[PDB]
Structures are given as C-alpha cells and as structure tokens.
C-alpha cells in the first residue's frame, strides 16, 4: 500500500497551498509544482525559474557516488512571473558594465561578501577578493550590510536583469532588432486541405499582434514572406508598392536570397501591400499540381536573409509532407525494423543526412531560430524535420491527419500563441557555481560548441533547460552550494540584456539530509531527458537498465543507511520519494523507451523532442496525466473536481471523465452514461447518438457544458500547447489509444509490478 501521486499532490496542496513562500533561507525546499501558492523573492531565485533534484547537495564525490542521486537543476529562465508577484528589475552599472568577480567572473549578486569597510568584496563562488570600483562604492553598516542592500536589486534579490554594454554584443555594435520570416508550403497537399488560405487569412489578422515593448510605439520587428514548393518564391513588399513582386529562385542546391530591402519590412508602413499579397497567395497557387517539395533550402534561405539584414530572427515555417524533391536535404522514405535489441535503433532517432546538423549550426551561428508547424498525413521523418527547430530553440507543432472542420482551432491558437510569446534572441547561457562543483551536462532546445556556454538562438517563457552537476573537489557544510545562472540575450527592441538567476543551496555530510531535500518532479525531469538524449547513442535495453539499477540503488542506499530497523518484507521509502517508484515506472512505460507495435516512429521522435524542452510543471503532467470525474461534478462554485488516479480502476460505467497530459485532451463516456448529462453536455439524448468523429466544441446548454467548458478552460490555461480534444465512446471504439494514457495500468508492467521488480534488485544488494 503506497502513497498515491494524488494523495501526495493534495497533501502538499493542503499544507502549503495559498501561502506565501519567500525565498530567504538557503536550501529551502519549495512547494511541489502542483501547488498554486504565492512566491516572494527575498534572496534565492523563485522556484518558477529554477528547481533542483535536491536542495541539499552531498559534500564529497564518494558520498554522491554512494546515494546515486543525480545533482541537477531544471532552469526556465524566462518563465512567466504571475500577475500578483514581483516583476524583474533592470539593473544598470553604467559604462564599465555590470560588476564581476575577477576570477570566476560571477555577476554581482547577494552571495557577495563585503569586507574592509566596503572597499573590497570576496566572491562567494571562488573566495577571491575584488576591489569595489569607485562609482559603486558604499559603506558597510553594522555587519557589512552595505547600507543600500535592500535598495539595490542586484544585492538583495535572486533574480534581476543587467543592462549589457557593447562588449556583450556581436561585433561590439548595438544589435539590430529581430524579424519574423513567414514561410508557407504551397504544394498541392496544402492547397487542398484548405490550409494555405487559413494561414494567409488569419495572419492578416495576426500580424497586428506582434509584440512591442511598452516603451516603444510600434514593434521594431520586421516581417518577410516566402512560399515554396520545391522551388522558392520570394516576395517584395517594400513600402512604396501597390502590388507585391515575386521572384522565384529555382536553383536549389545553391540557394540564395534575391533581394535586400523589400523583403523585411515594417508591417505598419507596408500594411496595404502585405494584405494585397496575402489576398493573392491562395489564388496564386490554386492550380498547383505540384507534389514533391524541398525543406532544408527553405531554412537555408531564411537564414541567409537574416544574415543579410544583419539581425537575429525567427522562421515561421508551415510544412506538410516528407520533402522528397531532389535538393540537398532530400529525405528518402525509409523506416526500418531495427528497434528492439538492435543497438542500431539509434539510427531511427537521428537525421538521415549530415546537412541538418550543420545547418542547425549555421542558424545558431547567426541567431536564427526556426519554428515548424508540421501537418503530416503519412510518415514524415520528424526525426530529421524537427532537428533544426529543436537545436535552434524553437518549437515543433505537429498536427496529424489534419482536417479543417476539427483542428482549425487547434492550429489557430498555437500560431496566435507562438507569435505573441515573449521572446529572446541570439542568447547564450552559462551556469556558474561555487567552489566544489561544476555543471558538466545540459539538456534542452540547445546547441553547444564548447563545454560551458549553452547557445540558444531563441528562447521563450516555455522552454526549460536541465543542467547536471558532478563534483570537483569538496563542498563545505558552512558554505553550501551556489548557482548563478546567467543568460546573455537580445530583446525585440534590439537591446542586449543579461538575465541573472541566483540560487543558494545547503550542503551536508549526513546522507539523511540528501534524501530529505529531494524533489521527485525535478528528478523525474532529469531522468527523462537524460534517458531521451541517450536514445541517440545507446540501446533502449541498456538505457532502461541504467534507469532501474539507479532507481533501486537509490532506495537501497536509503534502506541501509537512514532506514530505522524495519523487517525485510518491507520497502522503506523516504517522504520526498514516496511517489518516485510510481513516476519512474511511467517514464519507462512511455513509448519513447518502449516498442513499435502500434506507434509510429514519428510519434516517438515527436515525443522524444518535446520533452527535452519541458519545464518541471510540464514534465509532471505529461507522464502522470490528469483524470477528472465530470458526472459527479458540482453545479457551481468550485475550481475543479479533485483528481483521481490514472487507472481503469477508477472509471465508472455511469461516468464521464476528462484526461489530459498537456497535449491530448480526452473526454470519456461510459456506456451507461446518464443521458441527462449527455443532453446538456452534447445536446444529444442518447449515448447511441454521439459521434466520436465530430470532435468540435459543443455550443449549447447552460447547466453543465458550461461548467465543463470552463474547467477544460481551467485545464488549458497554463499549458503551452493547446490540446487536441478526442471524444471517446466507452466500449468497442478507439479508447484503445486513450487507454495508453492510463499509466498506472499494465496496457510493459504496472505500478505493482515495477514496485515488485525494484524490491528484487534492492534485496539483490544487501546489508
């Protein structure tokens, strides 16, 4: 009998929900992601920005090697700070630039000790003494509080931004503002399903909403347009034309951009032109009988254009089918049965060609970020198509078997949402640490060419990066462990800025303290990514083995070291890790580490990619889906129906449920469902009547439906990806797929089969 995930979620919800958590204490253990509390800074960066797998590190390499807890930090730097919480301050140290430790080069933060009357300070990270520069000098007070320590946000806060001076800029000239390039696949596929005109029509609408800082009057971001079908059509949209000009480039193989000026333009100046263009593109290609297309030469071009304007930018590519047309970048239609113990299964998660990896390199090199809206209808080799956006720090939206009368809304939101996203460009992040350890590994929508500087062509409030630490030397139980996460980037107003997150953690030589300070959600997040990146180098049986052997080894160490003497028939878990065997099982149960029958490679590669980026908020939900009961729903006044475990063993034939994992949202109806509900909710009298196929939100009724809609609304609200709704008839219908999201069930092995499997290897090791 184990503490269920939901018991644990709700417990901590009770204990800490709707209470202010203020980060003023080193090594504090923030609430779980599944708790909506209020956060106040006061010292250590908000857990909305950063969470760790332990908030108390081990102090010796051996001790860590003993417990086999991974030390790691999930970082989501540009996370959306909620309305009722404090915004980041923008600190500005003048011409000199932000103050820094001379040796580690750490930025002025609260972990900087002032000594000798305020003349000098000693870095917390490296224990080196720096001279306080004249302009920045101030008087220590009673204890060196350095009067002003509550006034200046670089001295008292965990998170703030620095204003970046010119030596932080490419070529030491102030960076230009970015630009969005909009790129449409106008082949036959996409003229038929009605997609192209959707994209052109809505956009007319959308462009308006491009973001602009509050200090400026119009967005400084320029906009350009290209449409391709195995040949690339560029459009001129300069301010002075009543008609837009088209210039086709047919020499793919050595692509180039046919113009300078007229390609990227202020939307407002060139408004009328652009509408006239966007009016015409759909018609323009109406009798296109073309079938094959080209992909890489499109990114290639977009990148070359942002190179030529000398600015960072974001590519908005809308594409349909496997690019088969002969150009560099061709992808053959090959999928193979090399995937159980093959040891070559890794070839399936890699791109086909060596051009995608380099191209990704070219983009990051020039601050170009590509985003891909993909509308498959057959194998598309997402392993290759989605490689560039992932390394380039963009997104992959994939809409299988898209149909205009269903997923039109899914698509339109994601485009709306991706445009208006707060964004940063041409960023490089690096995570500094106190004496005694260093970041040795990274996992994200990222690209690294040395071992220190995480390069991210673009970054949004949604993308997160997990950072794995190992041990250099030794950590003191006096100092604790420090992290300073610092991100160089370029704003949409063309300013170089420096976001800085500082965290302070405790350290300890007592193995007890290690396990007391763990976070499951974060540990899962590290494991997941660590595993998923391994997919590209090792066999999936070797991967899973490493995962189980390190799960047991964790509990086995806590058994034989901090476990009060209890019988050998028991499995003793600490409190931070009640639910870790459960979650760990679900990770291994997920198709990315599992087998072919009934899943495409595409669905596997898509999943493999999405996760890497994920925050801790998102990686929680994706592996342990939310299952809401709706038949028992209260009529009014309550935020949501409490959650229920993810097993078929909580389903009622008289019932109506809602399951979401962050990408799919299922609405499920028992054969015996109460037709009263079936009429308010769907407006049809009989379970018999309703159609799985007509998955379009339902218009009418006010008693329920509305209650249902809102909660689904409550459900969507913080997720980046609007979720495809999938109605499910209870028996003898598709539910076969829905079943797969019932994660505590068997389907590999169930929760009570892995909890059994780990206790075998736990006892394999004894004493």
């Amino acid at each position: 009998a184990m503490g269920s995930p939901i018991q644990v979620i709700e417990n901590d919800r009770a204990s800490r929900g709707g209470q202010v958590y203020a980060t003023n204490t080193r090594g504090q253990i923030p609430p779980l992601v599944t708790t909506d509390c209020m956060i106040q800074d006061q010292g250590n960066a908000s857990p909305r920005f950063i969470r760790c797998t332990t908030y108390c590190f081990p102090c010796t390499s051996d001790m860590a090697k003993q417990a086999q807890i991974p030390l790691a930090a999930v970082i989501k730097p540009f996370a959306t700070i909620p309305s009722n919480e404090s915004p980041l301050y923008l600190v500005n140290h003048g011409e000199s630039g932000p103050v820094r430790c001379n040796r580690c080069k750490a930025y002025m933060c609260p972990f900087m000790q002032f000594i000798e009357g305020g003349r000098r300070y000693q870095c917390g990270f490296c224990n080196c003494v720096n001279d306080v520069p004249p302009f920045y000098f101030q008087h220590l007070d009673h204890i060196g509080r350095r009067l002003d320590h509550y006034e200046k946000p670089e001295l008292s806060l965990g998170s703030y931004e620095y204003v970046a001076t010119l030596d932080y800029c490419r070529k030491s000239k102030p960076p230009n503002p970015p630009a969005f390039i909009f790129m449409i696949d106008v082949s036959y596929s996409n003229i038929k399903n009605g997609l192209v005109k959707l994209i052109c029509e809505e956009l007319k609408t959308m462009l308006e909403k491009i973001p602009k800082e509050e200090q400026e009057e119009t967005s400084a971001i320029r906009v350009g347009f290209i449409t391709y079908n195995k040949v690339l059509h560029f459009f001129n949209v300069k301010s002075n034309l009543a008609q837009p000009q088209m210039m086709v480039v047919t020499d793919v193989g050595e692509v180039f951009v046919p113009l300078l000026d007229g390609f990227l333009v202020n939307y407002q100046e060139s408004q009328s032109v652009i509408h006239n263009l966007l009016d015409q593109i759909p018609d323009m290609f109406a009798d296109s009988n073309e079938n094959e297309t080209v992909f890489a030469p499109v990114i290639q071009a977009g990148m070359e254009a942002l190179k030529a304007a000398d600015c960072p930018g974001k590519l908005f590519i809308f594409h349909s089918s496997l690019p088969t047309a002969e150009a560099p970048g061709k992808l053959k239609n090959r999928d193979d049965k090399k995937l159980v113990n093959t040891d070559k299964e890794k070839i399936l998660f890699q791109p086909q060609t060596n051009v995608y990896d380099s191209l990704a390199k070219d983009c990051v090199a020039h601050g170009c970020s590509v985003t891909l809206f993909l509308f498959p209808s057959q194998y598309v080799d997402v392993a290759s198509l989605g490689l560039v956006p992932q390394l380039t720090g963009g997104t992959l939206y994939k809409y299988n078997n898209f149909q205009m009368h269903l997923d039109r809304q899914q698509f339109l939101n994601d485009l709306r949402n991706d445009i208006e996203k707060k964004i940063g460009f041409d960023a490089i992040m690096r995570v500094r640490t106190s004496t005694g350890f260093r970041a040795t590994d990274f996992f994200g929508g990222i690209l690294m060419n040395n071992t220190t500087d995480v390069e991210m062509a673009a970054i949004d409030c949604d993308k997160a990066v997990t950072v794995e630490f190992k041990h250099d030397d030794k950590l003191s139980e006096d100092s604790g462990a420090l992290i300073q996460c610092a991100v160089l980037y370029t704003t949409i107003s063309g300013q170089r800025r420096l976001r800085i997150h500082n965290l302070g953690l405790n350290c300890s030589s007592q193995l007890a303290d290690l396990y007391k300070s763990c976070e499951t959600d974060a540990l899962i997040n590290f494991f997941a990514k660590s595993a998923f990146k391994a997919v590209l180098h090792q066999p999936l049986k070797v991967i899973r083995e490493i995962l189980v052997n390190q799960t047991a080894h964790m509990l086995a160490c806590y058994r034989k070291n901090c476990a009060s003497p209890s019988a050998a028939s028991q499995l003793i878990l600490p409190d931070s890790m009640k639910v870790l065997p459960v979650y760990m099982n679900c990770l291994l149960k997920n198709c990315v580490l599992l087998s072919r029958p009934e899943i495409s490679t595409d669905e596997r590669a898509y999943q493999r990619q999405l996760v890497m980026t994920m925050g801790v908020a998102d990686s929680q939900l994706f592996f342990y889906p939310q299952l809401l009961p709706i038949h028992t729903l209260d009529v009014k006044s309550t935020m949501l129906p409490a959650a229920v475990r993810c097993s078929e063993s909580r389903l009622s034939e008289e019932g109506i449920f809602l399951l979401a994992n962050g990408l799919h949202m299922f609405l499920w109806l028992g054969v015996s469902s109460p037709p009263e509900l079936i009429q308010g909710i769907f407006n049809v009298p009989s379970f018999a009547h309703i159609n799985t196929d007509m998955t379009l939100l339902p218009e009418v009724g006010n008693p329920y439906s509305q209650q249902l809609r809102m909660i689904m609304g409550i459900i969507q609200q913080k997720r980046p990806y609007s979720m495809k709704l999938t109605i499910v008839k209870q028996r003898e219908q598709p539910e076969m797929v829905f079943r797969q999201f019932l994660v505590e069930d068997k389907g590999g092995s169930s929760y009570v089969d892995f909890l059994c499997c780990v206790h075998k290897e736990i006892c394999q090791l004894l004493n």
Binding site: H233, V248, D261
Partner: protein, 716 residues
C-alpha cells in the same frame, strides 16, 4: 566600257569580282598574285525584280542540285534541259508544259540571272525580339534606354514575340502578361547554365510561352514594365565597379530561345552600359584601381581576362548560330565594355554592333531607331536564318568565305583542299541579313565558268524565300590573252578583297607579318602587270586599270584597321566589325575617306587626301564612313569668328557656311550606324582627326615616297 560592265553586274547580281576574265590554268592564276575572289551581296536591294511565287527546279543529280538558270541549254520540244554545272539531263515539271521558246519561264531569261522565289515551307513563324537589358547605369541612361525600347516595341509586327531579361548582380527572366502580380525568375550572376537546365528550371516543355508573348497581346503590360524598370538596387562601395554579369545573362538569353524556339528567326538584343565584372565572360575586375584591357596591356600579356572570357562569348556565338539566332550588342559607356571579347557574337551571327558614349544621346537614340527601318511595303529590311550555297563549274573550287557567317561543313566537289577564311565547306549559315550584308568568297582554279549563289532565308514577313544568282565570266588562255585578263581587273574590288584577307589574318595567330604579306603581293602585282624597263624606276607606269591600286594599299596599311595601337581594343573591334559586313562602296570609303572642298570659286569637289588640299580659303568635308568631319581653313575661320555670315550683305558667305553642314545632315540620316560628327577648324583641338587621315616595304611615309620605294622594288 569595262566600268559599265562592272556597275551593271553588281546592281543586277550583287557580285564584284577581283578578276572578270579568269586564267584557264591553275598556275598562271597563282602568279596573278590577287586571288579570283568575289564581294557578294545575297540580298542586294532589288526593287525591279518581281518575286516569282513558285518552287525552283534543282538538277536531279544529288551532288550537284544546282538551280535552273539562264546559262542552261534547253530543248523546249521534248521538254528537256541539262545542268550546265554537271551536264546532267533533267526533265521539267508538269505545270511547265506550255514552255515555248517565245513563252519561256522567267529564270531562263538573261535579265533574270538574279532572281528570288517563294517557298511553301509550311510553318509561318512570327518574329522574336528578346531584349536583354543591363541595369547598372545612371538613371539618366537607364531612363533614356527605357524610352528607346518602348518605341521599338511600337514598331514591331503585331504577331511579333517579345521578351525581357534584365540583369546586374543577378539575372532576371521576366514573366510577361502575368498580370496583377509581376513575377520573374532570378539566377546567380556568377553561375553559367545549360539550356537544358534553363528549360527544366523555368518549368518549360521540350522543343507563345510565359516568357515570350505576342506584342498585340502584351503591350500595356510590357511597356508598363519597362517604364517601371529601375537601376540595379545593390549599392556600389567606394572605388568599385558594379557587379555586372554580362556573361551569364546572355548565356541565359541564348538558352531561353534555344529550347523554346530553336531554328527560327530571333534577335537577341543586349544593351550593356559597362564591362562584365563577374564571370564567366568577365572582362575586368571589380575595383576601379585597375584600368581595363588596353592594347598595350593585352600585348605585354597583362590582360588576364581576355583569353578566358573571349572563349566564353565565342561558345555562345556558335551556340546562338547553331539555332539560327542573332545577337546584337548595344554598348554605351564612357569606357570600354568588352566589345573585343564579345565581338564574336555580332560577328558570327548576323548581329548588329553599336557603340556610344551613353544611351541618352542622339547618337544612340537615332542609331537604335534605324535598326527598325521599313521598306516600301512596311516590312523590316531584315532577314533571318539564311543559308548560303555556292556551286561552281568543275574547274573552280571554293577556298572559303570571310564575312558574317558560320560554316555548315558541307563537303562537296566544289570544296577546295586549301582553305581560306571560313572554309572546307560550300554552305554557310548567315543568321541575320540586311540588304547590305556582304561576304568575301575566295575561289581557286584547278568557254565560260559559272558560280551560283543560292540563299534561302526568312523574310521579315515570315515568308520563307529563296534567292538565286548565277553569274558567268570568260576563260582565257593566259599564254595568249594576258591582256584580256589584265583588262578585267577590278582594282577597287581586289583591294577590298585583299583588305579582309589581311584583316581576318590579324585575328589569327600571325603577328605584324601582315604589313609584310600585304606589301609582297603589292610588289608582285606591280611586277606582273606594270610597264617598265628593268631598273628604270622612273620607267614605271601603271595601266589605268591598276594605277589606283597602290594608293589603296597605302591607305589601307596605315588605317585604324591595321595600326590598332592608337585605339581602344573595343574601337578596333567595332571598326573591323562594320568593314567585314559592308559592300564595296562603303568598304571603300572606310579605307580611303572621301574628301570634298567648298570654296567661293566653284561647286563642291572631290579633292585628294593630301595636305595640299587643305587651304585657308576653303572649307573641307571629310567623310570617313564612321565619322563626318567639317574643316574650316584658317581664313574662313576668322571670317566666321567675326560674325559676317549673319549680316544681310554677306548672303553668299552665309551659304558657303551652310552647304557642307547641309550635306553633313543627309549622311547623318541614310547611314545606319550614325557617324560621329565633328565641327572643327584650323587649330581645333579636333583638327587632329583630319590631319591624321590625310624588313617592311617602308617606314610610315608620304604617299609619293611610298610609291618610290615600291617602283624601285618593282623594277628590280
């Protein structure tokens, strides 16, 4: 008179021979020194002849295939004729049945030696006018050129096809008639294409398109397009030449027509406003620090881009010629554009070449306008895809031709082993023809002899026509009739016929071994045909049938054609291009300028090109074919400097001041490449243009001295 003979057989048959009586034996032909050769015009203006709308008759022998001519013997009874050339007996066609010694067909009439026929080929093709426009120039020049094109567009036949490729850093193939959105296919200005590739890429089929569309359909759109043409966008850093891809642009032009309308009348009209600066066909670098190829540069082996880039245009030309298309070049800039390297294209196809200071000048606007001169019937004086076939009596074989043409390498019994010029063939293709287009053909001996000139072409009306000329000249026993042979000598025609021989040699590998070659023959020619006593130079005399020929050689050897040091390699190429094209009259004027004198004392007169004719009480009008120069003698100058002409007393000094300028005007209208004009006087900084037009055999010298060294060399 022999003169009346020559003038008659030229106007009738387009022919001018070096000899009009031929040595019947190969050897005494070899020691005639000047070869048996003809200046031939295939489309010589012939308003008197009436076209015959019926197929010609070709001798039934395969190797021969000659056309029925007056020289043939006919037996009207029995309906039979025999080829004069091969002696084969041939029947007549059905429709000919009523053939009557009185009622005999046109072409058997001695009046009809030269005659034209109207084929019924079948396909009636439109005309094709591909404009290839450079955009690297000032808005001054590009606007002016734009205007020059808009009118050219108005003059075209309604059925005509037009297209517009523009270029600069990159090459644009515009899609025309594509209304409401203008689309154009863009190519790197640095990568050469094959037509096949261009056909695939422009999304074309094999063998109206979206690129070439009928003028009556696309007039509003194109003209509008042209009006909206602006100069190459990409800016030009300080101390730099633009990136101009002359080379690739043309290659794309030639391609676009090679693969849509192969083998039919078309004219690629390329307007450039600078040198090519980004190869292939590159002519110079893109930094102004390095001046362009200079003859001295090119001679000292310090012109890197001449061999490479020439072999490029040389390939295009033959690619253009293979498909029956013309390449005009229209070059206007304050410095060179690489006419030297691109010369083959105008030269091998029937192309025009025009050279000017800028497009915004009368000189150009007028030159360009003429090119669309219409005849009485309202059709262009143009011809396309001509195919020239020359047949000769057995005794005679062909060495080859020199002029605007390309060999089809047709072997035949009429083909001599020792070839000259474009040789080893009895068929040339002349891609573009004009009533002026003139070829030098070079014959070779091995009762009369005959040569038949058959020219099929595409008349501007799109009517496919054939023109046939048959000429005969008498055979002579050179051991007996030497005088009868020396009597027939065309000093005028032989002179030109040599000039081209000499000039065509100065394109091939030979160095200054030409002033040498050209004098050795001139001395030989004296020896064979001069009256003298050995070693009595004073003794030398020349027949009136020869007396002018050494004065021609004197002028030819000192001309811009051979002394190319004082000219821009582009100039020299442009002079030579017009000379090899021209009939005898013009050809003659180029080599020896006509000078006229205007004085109070009598009407205007042809005077010698000597200093002696420059007088201070005389106005001169020099008329080199290329330039028109008016010279005021020192006294008439001051009279003009004092304003006398305006006063009503001096009506007569007003009129002497006007009469040359009147004639200057006439010449500035009938001549196709409008001639530069010069108004100068004694001491004028531009007087030099006059004073300059007025072992080796000799160092450059006076005419009389020239004759002296010659005489004393002849008689030894």
């Amino acid at each position: 008179t022999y003169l009346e003979f020559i003038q008659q057989n030229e106007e009738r048959d387009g022919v001018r021979f070096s000899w009009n009586v031929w040595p019947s034996s190969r050897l005494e032909a070899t020691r005639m020194v000047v070869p048996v050769a003809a200046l031939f015009t295939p489309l010589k203006e012939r308003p008197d002849l009436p076209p015959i709308q019926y197929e010609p008759v070709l001798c039934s022998r395969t190797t021969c295939r000659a056309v029925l001519n007056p020289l043939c013997q006919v037996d009207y009874r029995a309906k039979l004729w025999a080829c004069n050339f091969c002696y084969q007996r041939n029947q007549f066609p059905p429709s000919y049945a009523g053939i009557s010694e009185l009622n005999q067909p046109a072409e058997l009439l001695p009046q009809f030696s030269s005659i034209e026929y109207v084929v019924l080929r079948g396909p009636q093709m439109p005309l094709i006018f591909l404009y290839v426009v450079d955009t690297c120039m000032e808005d001054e020049d590009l606007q002016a050129l734009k205007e020059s094109m808009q009118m050219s567009l108005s003059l075209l036949p309604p059925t005509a096809l037009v297209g517009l490729i523009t270029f600069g850093r990159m090459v644009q193939v515009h899609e025309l008639g594509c209304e409401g959105i203008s689309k154009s296919y863009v190519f790197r200005g640095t990568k050469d294409l094959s037509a096949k590739q261009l056909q695939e890429m422009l999304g074309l089929s094999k063998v109206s398109n979206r690129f070439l569309q009928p003028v009556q359909k696309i007039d509003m759109n194109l003209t509008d397009l042209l009006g909206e043409l602006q100069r190459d966008p990409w800016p030009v850093p300080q101390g730099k030449r633009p990136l101009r891809s002359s080379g690739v642009a043309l290659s794309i032009a030639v391609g676009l027509l090679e693969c849509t309308f192969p083998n039919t009348g078309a004219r690629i009209m390329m307007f450039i406003g600078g040198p090519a600066t980004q190869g292939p066909g590159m002519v110079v670098g893109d930094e102004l620090k390095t001046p362009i190829r200079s003859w001295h540069d090119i001679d000292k082996d310090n012109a890197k881009y001449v061999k490479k880039g020439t072999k490029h245009f040389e390939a295009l030309a033959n690619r253009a010629a293979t498909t029956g298309h013309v390449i005009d070049i229209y070059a206007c800039a304050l410095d060179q554009t690489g006419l030297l390297e691109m010369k083959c294209c105008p030269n091998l196809t029937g192309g025009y070449m025009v050279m000017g200071d800028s497009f915004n000048t009368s000189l150009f606007k007028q030159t360009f306008q003429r090119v669309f001169t219409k005849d009485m019937h309202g059709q262009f004086k143009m011809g396309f895809g001509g195919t020239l076939e020359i047949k000769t009596s057995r005794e005679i074989k062909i060495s080859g031709a020199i002029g605007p043409c390309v060999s089809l390498n047709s072997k035949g019994p009429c083909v001599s082993e020792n070839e000259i010029g474009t040789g080893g063939t009895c068929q040339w293709k002349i891609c573009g023809l004009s009533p002026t287009t003139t070829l030098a053909i070079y014959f070779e001996v091995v009762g009369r002899g005959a040569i038949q000139f058959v020219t099929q072409y595409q008349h501007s009306s799109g009517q496919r026509r054939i023109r046939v000329t048959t000429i005969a000249r008498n055979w002579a026993d050179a051991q007996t009739q030497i005088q009868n042979i020396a009597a027939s000598f065309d000093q005028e025609a032989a002179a030109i016929l040599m000039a081209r021989l000499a000039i065509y040699r100065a394109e091939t590998e030979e160095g200054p071994d030409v002033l040498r070659w050209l004098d050795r023959q001139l001395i030989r020619l004296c020896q064979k045909f001069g009256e003298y006593h050995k070693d009595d130079p004073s003794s030398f005399r020349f027949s009136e049938t020869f007396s002018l020929y050494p004065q021609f050689m004197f002028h030819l050897r000192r001309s811009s054609f051979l002394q190319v040091f004082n000219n821009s390699p582009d100039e020299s190429s442009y002079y030579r291009h017009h000379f090899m094209r021209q009939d005898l009259t013009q050809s003659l004027i180029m080599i020896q300028p006509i000078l006229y004198a205007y004085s109070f004392s009598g009407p205007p007169e042809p005077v010698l090109l000597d200093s002696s004719s420059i007088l201070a009480d005389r106005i001169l009008l020099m008329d080199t074919f290329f330039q028109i120069l008016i010279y005021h003698g020192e006294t008439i100058a001051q009279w003009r400097k004092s304003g006398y002409q305006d006063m009503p007393e001096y009506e007569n000094f007003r009129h002497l001041l006007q009469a040359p300028v009147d004639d200057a005007q006439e010449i500035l209208h009938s001549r196709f490449p409008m001639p530069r004009y010069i108004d100068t006087e004694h001491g004028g900084s531009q007087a030099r243009f006059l004073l300059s037009k007025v072992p080796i055999l000799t160092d450059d010298v006076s005419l009389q001295v020239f004759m002296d060294h010659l005489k004393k060399l002849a008689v030894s």
